[PDB]
């Protein structure tokens, strides 16, 4: 079962730190220069023996100075939207990120919100107000230490399969790739 997922959120919030791990393997990843994105395949086996593959797109840093192309979003089944709990700007732009994603994919596709860098803070209240009170499934994570790495994917698999009791029975390779694919940004 295969789903495209977009990572979104301001530059510096930890998107690349989160995803840029070995996962299904370095060689399996792909780069698309037209879009400015790397695909990271991550496969989990569930409790009923289904193979669930997420093709998780990450930017090469262009969000720092520019708007992402529609092709980044097109075909996505879901998004993981990050902010940095130590920076209010990143929280403020959450509604803008949601609108940008939904403007291409529509309002049904699940968006999971991750409060990142909880290891280092912006209250969840501020998130709720920036987002006009709309509910999104919400996790506190540390992309650095991989704390709670699986939770957004577990939620997404449940939505997509319709099985609220779906669990992952395989463990993912969480080693950092040591591959820097980011464009230099002065
Ligand atoms: N302390 C801490 N730093 C993080 C975490 N995730 C990312 N960073 C740092 O934040 C900076 C931006 O990370 P990056 O993954 O490039 O963010 P992106 O621009 O959203 O892809 C880097 O210096 C990372 O080391 C985290 O969970 N904790
Ligand atoms: Mg990045």
Structural domains of the chain ordered from first start = 1-186 (3.40.50.300)
Please, what's the b/e burial string for 31-59 (b: 16 or more CB within 10 A of its CB; e: otherwise)? eeeebbbbbbebebebeeeeebebbbbbb
DSSP state of 1: -
8 A C-beta contact, residue 151 and residue 28: no
Task: Select from 10, 15, 17, 140 the residue to mutate for testing ligand 1; criterion: most ligand atoms less than 8 Å from CB.
Answer: 17
Chain breaks in the chain (C to N over 2.5 A) after: 120
Q: According to the entry, how was the structure determined?
A: X-ray
Structure's resolution in angstroms: 1.8
Q: Cα(156)–Cα(89) distance, rounded to whole angstroms?
A: 27
DSSP state of 62: G
75 carries a ligand binding annotation: no
8 A C-beta contact, residue 77 and residue 160: yes
Q: Starting at the edge strand that comes first in sequence, how are the strands of the sheet with 30-32 ordered?
A: 30-32, 37-45, 51-59, 2-8, 78-84, 111-116, 137-140
The backbone region for 132, taken as left when phi is positive above 0, alpha when psi lies in -120 to 50, beta otherwise, is left
Give burial (CB, 10 Å; 0-12/13-18/19+) of 95.
middle
8 A C-beta contact, residue 80 and residue 151: no
Give burial (CB, 10 Å; 0-12/13-18/19+) of 84.
buried
Per DSSP, helices labelled H in 7-93 are 15-19, 70-73, 88-92
| Residue 58 Cα to ligand 2 middle (Å) | 7
Contacts by 62-69, CB closer than 8 A, 24 or more apart: 62/36, 62/183, 63/10, 63/11, 64/11, 64/12, 64/185, 65/185, 67/100, 68/8, 68/36, 68/100, 69/34, 69/35, 69/36
DSSP state of 174: -
| Residue 15 Cα to ligand 2 middle (Å) | 5
**Token output for 121:** 């803070």
Q: Are strands 111-116 and 137-140 parallel, antiparallel or unpaired?
A: parallel
Listed residue (151, 144, 157) closest to 51, CA to CA: 157
């Amino acid at each position: 079962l295969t789903y495209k997922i977009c990572l979104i959120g301001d530059g510096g919030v930890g998107k690349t730190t989160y995803i840029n791990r070995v996962l299904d393997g370095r060689f399996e990843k792909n780069y698309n220069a037209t879009v400015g994105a790397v695909n990271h395949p991550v496969t989990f086996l569930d409790d009923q023996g289904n193979v669930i593959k997420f093709n998780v797109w990450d930017t090469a840093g262009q969000e720092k100075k520019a708007v992402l192309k529609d092709v980044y979003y097109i075909g996505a089944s879901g998004a993981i939207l990050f902010f940095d709990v130590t920076s209010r700007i990143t929280c403020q732009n959450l509604a803008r990120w949601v609108k940008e994603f939904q403007a291409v994919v529509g309002n049904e596709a699940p968006i999971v919100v991750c409060a990142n860098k909880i290891d280092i803070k912006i209250s969840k209240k501020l998130v709720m107000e920036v987002l006009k009170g709309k509910n999104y499934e919400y996790f506190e994570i540390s992309a650095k230490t991989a704390h709670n790495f699986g939770l957004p994917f577990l939620h997404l698999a449940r939505i997509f399969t319709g099985r609220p009791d779906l669990i992952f029975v395989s463990n993912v390779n969480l080693e950092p790739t040591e591959v820097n694919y980011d464009y230099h940004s002065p």
